Design an enzyme around this catalytic site. Structure first.
Site, short mmCIF file in Angstrom:
data_model
loop_
_atom_site.label_atom_id
_atom_site.label_comp_id
_atom_site.label_asym_id
_atom_site.label_seq_id
_atom_site.Cartn_x
_atom_site.Cartn_y
_atom_site.Cartn_z
N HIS A 4 66.48 22.57 48.88
CA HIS A 4 66.50 23.22 50.18
C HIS A 4 68.40 24.22 50.10
O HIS A 4 68.45 25.80 50.24
CB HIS A 4 66.24 23.16 50.62
CG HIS A 4 65.45 23.35 51.23
ND1 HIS A 4 64.10 23.51 51.32
CD2 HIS A 4 64.33 21.73 51.76
CE1 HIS A 4 62.56 22.42 50.59
NE2 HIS A 4 62.67 21.82 51.34
N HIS B 184 65.19 18.85 57.71
CA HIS B 184 63.80 19.44 56.45
C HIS B 184 63.49 20.93 56.94
O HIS B 184 63.99 21.64 57.45
CB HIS B 184 62.63 18.65 57.10
CG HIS B 184 60.73 19.37 56.91
ND1 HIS B 184 59.92 18.74 56.45
CD2 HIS B 184 60.53 20.29 58.19
CE1 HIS B 184 58.92 19.26 56.39
NE2 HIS B 184 59.44 20.28 57.59
#
Length: 126
Positions: free
Chosen positions: A14, A117
């Site tokens: 990410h 996350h």
């Protein structure tokens, strides 16, 4: 829990300071980040967002620069992102995505100050 292992995996999946929609396929594929669907050794994730910022800046979202959102944390400021949504293919090296460039208040899961996350929007694939 291995927070540092999860943080490194969060960087691979990410964090992309110079990402662009044209790079979704190559960056997700096996010649680069080799991002793969959970529970498979070769499947295509339905959606993967890249944050177009430096890792230290994103980490602040797990500190002073974020606020609670359930079991997750929402950034106080928006961040540039590239959202890659699966369009066709079911396994590497042929996971082909459509990308959209936007600015979003990012929602992450944090552990002791480290992002581990990214909370994706639900998507419609294919």
């Amino acid at each position: 829990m291995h927070v540092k292992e999860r943080y490194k995996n969060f960087l691979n999946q990410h964090v992309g300071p110079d990402m662009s929609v044209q790079r979704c396929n190559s960056e997700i594929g096996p010649n680069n980040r080799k991002i793969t669907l959970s529970g498979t050794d070769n499947g295509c994730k339905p959606v993967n967002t890249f944050i177009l910022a430096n890792k230290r800046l994103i980490k602040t979202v797990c500190g002073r620069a974020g606020s609670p959102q359930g079991n997750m944390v929402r950034s106080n400021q928006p961040f540039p992102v590239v959202k890659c949504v699966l369009n066709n293919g079911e396994r590497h090296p042929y996971c082909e995505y459509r990308g959209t460039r936007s600015t979003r208040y990012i929602v992450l899961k944090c552990e002791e100050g480290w992002p581990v996350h990214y909370h994706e929007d639900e998507v419609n694939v294919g």
